[PDB]
Amino acid sequence: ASIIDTVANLAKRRGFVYQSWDYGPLGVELKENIKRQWWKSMVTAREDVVGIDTSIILTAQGIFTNFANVVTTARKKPPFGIAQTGKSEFEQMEMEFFVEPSTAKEWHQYWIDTRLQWYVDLGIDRDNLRLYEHPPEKLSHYAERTVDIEYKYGFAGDPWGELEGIANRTDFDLSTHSKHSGVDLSYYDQATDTRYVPYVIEPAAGLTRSLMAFLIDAYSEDEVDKRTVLRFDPRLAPVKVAVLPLSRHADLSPKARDLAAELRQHWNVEFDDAGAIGRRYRRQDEVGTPYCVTVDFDSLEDNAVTVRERDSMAQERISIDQVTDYLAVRLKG
Amino acid sequence: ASIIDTVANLAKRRGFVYQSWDYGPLGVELKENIKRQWWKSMVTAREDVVGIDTSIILTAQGIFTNFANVVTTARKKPPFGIAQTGKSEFEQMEMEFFVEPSTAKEWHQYWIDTRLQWYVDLGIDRDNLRLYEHPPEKLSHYAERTVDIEYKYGFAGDPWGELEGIANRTDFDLSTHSKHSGVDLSYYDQATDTRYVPYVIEPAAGLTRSLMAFLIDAYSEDEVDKRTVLRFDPRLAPVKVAVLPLSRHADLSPKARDLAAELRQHWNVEFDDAGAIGRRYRRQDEVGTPYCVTVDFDSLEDNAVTVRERDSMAQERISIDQVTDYLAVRLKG
Ligand SMILES: [Mg+2]
Ligand SMILES: [Mg+2]
């Protein structure tokens, strides 16, 4: 079986996806973590980018139409961006970056690079990412230049697939909307330049494609005794912590559950006392849980817990009073 | 003008909503904060509730169909819940809580109370919330009992409106799906009870209605010199912090912007040096920013900043090194 078939079998088995395709309990968490990271690094982390959410009663058009409004209430001037999570019925994280046409090309390259680095910063092997520029044959009527980030999914024939497209649509969008709506959307310069209709650089990433890329790239099988493991970035892992009492003994449970409640205040935690500890470690590793917290009888007097890191499996026993902080620093976000 | 007209004018003016209706830059942040709080207190904060996301190609049905799968991969037994953000084209935060029929009524009351408290815990005046039980005339064919939480929006005639419905749909849903799909979804008991098809308690809250209720309830006008203010809970405010240098002097900006960058790592921050400080304080108050951080020339040597709290307007000057923590403790989430 191919890598894709293996990962899909795992995803169905552990509830990442359910055959229908619908996202199961882990799939929703991974999807929302991906969306949160995209919004964080695109909207809230950038002063020149603000968000918007439009209705698609039956998508990027909803941004252009509201351009004027955004310029007024948000008090933004080019270069600046408007981001959105558009239900293209698959979701798509898209952004329209309005810039002076003179800089259009420079900005384009910027967003071609930044976006790529984004994926790399979340744990994707750069060797599994590449750039594919559309020739004039592909270039849409409005797009002067189009560059697709492509990920090595592992298909038959061509193993690469589009993951995100960054296009230079020029001034076609705003000009069309101005002509059709009878409203001037021009930012004619009165400061060291001439009149222009803002050019648009459009990064658009299919959320499903992003999740598939992260899931496939995180897969690993390392020894002997083989171990299937999703090496997710901590910010993307569906489950951040696993509170695993050493046994079902009624002494460990009342304290391990209190610790799990403390942790659930902040992160999504999974509590499991079923069976042997090694099986539970393998369970958590299969779904990329970055840390496991084990409570044993020695904790009833020593008042500590064993923290096991996913990839290395190295264990460190630390005071139960500090666990939260010890995890926060390591979980980020 | 009515309270609703006033709040709507403010929302359009400040970009909460744009006339089309679409959410502007602040509206998206408020909406996502509401959704995050709902998911946090319903899914990640409860071990007996897990999430799911289904496709609605043209909503609660998608949950029932996947019930079996969830019971297998999630390893859950009744009483337990499955939550979802269903695109009913308006979004709706819904949950299906499967329970043994014997407890169905008790659990029902629980979710009638808990949900209500949820709103109250996020800053809604309990006096503006009420319960409305549907008579048998209203009770749907499948619903034995139906209770709507209603909020005092301020309409004409009847000023109340549905905000969230909590229904006891009995075993109609799973029984229908079993008959139609040829799959047994029964949890026939083999432990101190008899055979049953899990009963369903359904809390469903319209996200738009929730956002409208929060926006309306947060509105206030307090003196003299009147001050319009959205008294949002810190977890719901679209903007958590406002870095406001005392003036555009080139000495304050390079440091205030560094502080704003530090804060943007964590929260959504708004930087504004335009005009007088009082006007900027009023701007931030109009949209419910819980804290304003002012940098003045005294900071260039004292290395401190003035933190102004929204409601009280009380100011406290604290070291710029501690600001993040000082805000974290006060912003929650
Ligand atoms: Mg921004
Ligand atoms: Mg849960």
Numbering used by the authors:
A (entry chain A), B (entry chain A): 2 to 21, 32 to 69, 164 to 193, 209 to 343, 351 to 460
Text from the published report:
Glycyl tRNA synthetases (GlyRSs) are prospective drug targets for combating Mycobacterium tuberculosis (Mtb) and cancer in humans. Structures of all three forms – complete, or in some cases partial – have now been determined using X-ray diffraction or cryo-EM. Both Mycobacterial and human cells express the α2 subtype, and notably, the GlyRS gene in humans encodes one product that serves both the cytosol and mitochondria, which has obvious advantages for the design of selective inhibitors. Similar to the TtGlyRS, the two Mycobacterial GlyRS subunits adopt the canonical architecture consisting of an N-terminal catalytic domain and a C-terminal anticodon binding domain connected by a β-hairpin insertion. The catalytic core contains the class-II specific antiparallel β-sheet having the characteristic insertion domain after the first strand of the core β-sheet, and the anticodon recognition domain adopts the HGPT fold also found in HisRS, ProRS, and ThrRS.
Crystal structures were also obtained for the AMP-bound states of the two orthologs, and in the case of MtrGlyRS, the apo state. MtrGlyRS was readily produced using standard protocols, and 37.3 mg of protein were purified from 2 l of culture. Strikingly, significant portions of the dimer interface and active site are unstructured in the MtrGlyRS apoenzyme crystal. The disordered sections include nearly 30 residues that form intersubunit contacts in the more ordered dimers, with greater than half being hydrophobic. The pronounced disorder observed in the apo MtrGlyRS crystal supports this notion: the insertion domain and two tRNA major groove recognition loops are absent in the electron density map.
